[PDB]
Amino acid sequence: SGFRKMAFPSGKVEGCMVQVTCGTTTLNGLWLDDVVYCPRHVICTSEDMLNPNYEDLLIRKSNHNFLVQAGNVQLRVIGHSMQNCVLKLKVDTANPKTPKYKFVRIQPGQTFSVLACYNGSPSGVYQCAMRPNFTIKGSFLNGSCGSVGFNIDYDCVSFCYMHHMELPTGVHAGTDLEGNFYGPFVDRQTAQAAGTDTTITVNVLAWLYAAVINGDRWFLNRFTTTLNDFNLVAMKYNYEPLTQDHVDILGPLSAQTGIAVLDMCASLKELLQNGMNGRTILGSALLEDEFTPFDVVRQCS
C-alpha cells in the first residue's frame, strides 16, 4: 500500500543526455541515434533576445560552431537543421545507449517524469503534470534548458517535453520534441504571462478513487449530481470543467470501487465547500491533481 508521487526510472534517459555549447551559451541536448536535439535559443546572443531571427542566425552558423560533449567524448557535428523551436544537430556517431523511443505530444492534465540536467549531467528526477494553462510547475535553475520529460511503457521511452524557459510567475514552458510549444508561448524574452491556472478535475477524482481503494472513505456522501450542476459549481473554485470523456475515463475506477462517477463528483463538491477539517486524504491536507486515472491503476490496481 502507500501512495507516493512516483517518477519513472531515469537510466534510459541518462544515457542520452549531452552538453551543447554555442559561443558563450551551454545547455543540455538529447542524443538519439545520430541526432542531438536541443532548444534553438542556444544560438541566441545577449544582443537580440527580444526578437531573435532564428532563420537568419542559423544560416550564419557552421557545424564546428556547435560544441557537443558526451561525457568525456566530443562529438563531431556534420549537419544542422531547425524544426520549429528545436535544433537538430546531426553527428558522426550514433548513440549506442539509444533506447526504444518515440515522440508524443501530451495534453493538459497528463503526467510525466523530468530528468533535470546541468551541463549534460543529471541532477535529479521528479514527477509532474502539464497544467491546464500549458505550463509546468517544475524545479529548474539556470542551465537546465534542454532537460526533457518522458514516460516509460514496457521498455519504450516516450519523450513528451523539452524545457526552454521560465516565466515571470515562476512556472516553466517548453516544447514537444518536434519543437512545437505547449501553450501560447514563444522563445523570445518579451513580456509573456501564463493564463490563470486551474485544478485538473479528472485527476482529483482519480485520486479520490485511489483513497477509497486504499481504505479511506470519510469524504463520501449520499448525494449525486448532474454533470452540468457539478461544472457550474467547480468552475467557481477555478476547477477545470469535467467532460463526458473524463466521465468515461473514470469508468474503470468507478467499477473497482462501486462508486458511480457522478456520486464521487458530489463528494468533491462537498469537499470544496467544507475543506478537510484538519483531516487528510492519502497524507495530504490539499486535494491532489497530479495523478492521472492511468497512474492510479498503475500504482494501486
> Helix 261-274 vs helix 227-235: angle between axes, to the nearest 10 degrees?
30
Per partner kind, with CB cut-offs from 5 to 8 A, the member of Na ion, its own copies, none near residue 263 is Na ion
Kindly tell me which residue out of 54, 126, 237, 294 binds its own copies, with binding defined by CB under 8 A: 126
Cell reading at 11: 537510466
| Interface region with its own copies, contact rule CB under 8 A, candidates 44-52, 103-111, 134-142, 197-205 | 134-142
**CA 129, CA 179: separation in Å to the nearest integer?**
19
| Interface region with its own copies, contact rule CB under 8 A, candidates 194-202, 243-251, 263-271, 284-292 | 284-292
Using CB under 5 A, list all residues that contact Na ion.
221, 223, 263, 266-267
Q: Is 25 in the site for its own copies (CB under 8 A)?
A: no
Q: How far is the CB of 55 from its own copies (least distance, A)?
A: 32
Check 145, 160, 265, 300 and give the catalytic one: 145
Burial of 130 (0-12, 13-18, 19+ CB in 10 A): buried
41 included as an active-site residue: yes
Q: Is 172 in the site for its own copies (CB under 8 A)?
A: yes
Q: Is 140 in the site for its own copies (CB under 8 A)?
A: yes
Which residue type occupies 212?
V
Cell reading at 8: 519513472
Per partner kind, with CB cut-offs from 5 to 8 A, the member of its own copies, Na ion, none near residue 10 is its own copies
Per partner kind, with CB cut-offs from 5 to 8 A, the member of its own copies, Na ion, none near residue 258 is none
254, 260 contact by CB (below 8 A): yes
Per partner kind, with CB cut-offs from 5 to 8 A, the member of its own copies, Na ion, none near residue 20 is none
For residue 262, how many C-alpha atoms fall within 13 Å in the half-sphere facing its CB? 11
- Strands 156-166 and 100-103, by their bridges, are parallel
> What value, to the nearest 5°, has the Cα angle with vertex 249 and ends 248 and 255?
80
Q: Is 188 in the site for its own copies (CB under 8 A)?
A: no
Q: Residue 202: in which H helix or E strand, if any?
A: helix 201-213
Per partner kind, with CB cut-offs from 5 to 8 A, the member of its own copies, Na ion, none near residue 9 is its own copies
Q: Is 263 in the site for its own copies (CB under 8 A)?
A: no
| Interface region with its own copies, contact rule CB under 8 A, candidates 4-12, 100-108, 176-184, 244-252 | 4-12
Question: In DSSP terms, which residues pair with 174 in a beta bridge?
Answer: 163
Q: In Å, how far are 124, 190, 219, 270 from 237, measured between CA atoms?
A: 34, 31, 18, 12
Query: Between 14 and 263, whose beta carbon lies closer to Na ion?
Result: 263
For residue 173, how many C-alpha atoms fall within 13 Å in the half-sphere facing its CB? 24
Q: Is 81 in the site for its own copies (CB under 8 A)?
A: no
Measured in whole angstroms, the distance separating CA 167 from the mean position of its chain's CA atoms is 15
145 included as an active-site residue: yes
| Interface region with its own copies, contact rule CB under 8 A, candidates 32-40, 100-108, 114-122, 181-189 | 114-122
Query: Between 128 and 213, whose beta carbon lies closer to Na ion?
Result: 213
The DSSP call for residue 136 is: B
- Which residues would be at the binding site for its own copies (CB under 8 A)? 1-12, 14-15, 115-119, 121-126, 128, 137-144, 166, 170-172, 214-215, 280, 283-286, 299-300
List residues with catalytic annotation.
41, 145
